[PDB]
């Protein structure tokens, strides 16, 4: 508990990276968050949207 400053700096960066990775799973309104689902299911003009 003495090193709370340094272990918090490690935690803030780990939480920032894990948030950035978990945001790959978000749809943002796309039919899937997996980019290969879009490119396998949809033809170019629909896929681009």
């Amino acid at each position: 508990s003495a090193l709370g400053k340094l272990q918090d700096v490690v935690n803030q960066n780990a939480q920032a990276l894990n948030t950035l990775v978990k945001q790959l799973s978000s749809n943002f309104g796309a039919i899937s968050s997996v980019l290969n689902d879009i490119l396998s299911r949809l033809d170019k003009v629909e896929a681009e949207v």
């Binding site: 396998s40 299911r41 949809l42 896929a47």
Partner: protein
């Protein structure tokens, strides 16, 4: 079937060439809502319901 008692056939354990459907001169519309009809032959499905 009637509209009110519309009929579902579950389709299973097959290979299906959807180009044979999509290229058919019979159909006046073929609108698809999450797969494009050109791409159907590249996919395999856990169930299909007609």
């Amino acid at each position: 079937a009637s509209v009110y008692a519309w009929n579902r056939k579950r389709i299973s354990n097959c290979v299906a060439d959807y180009s044979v459907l999509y290229n058919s001169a019979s159909f006046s519309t073929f609108k698809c809502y999450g797969v494009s009809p050109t791409k159907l032959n590249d996919l395999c499905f856990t169930n299909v319901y007609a």
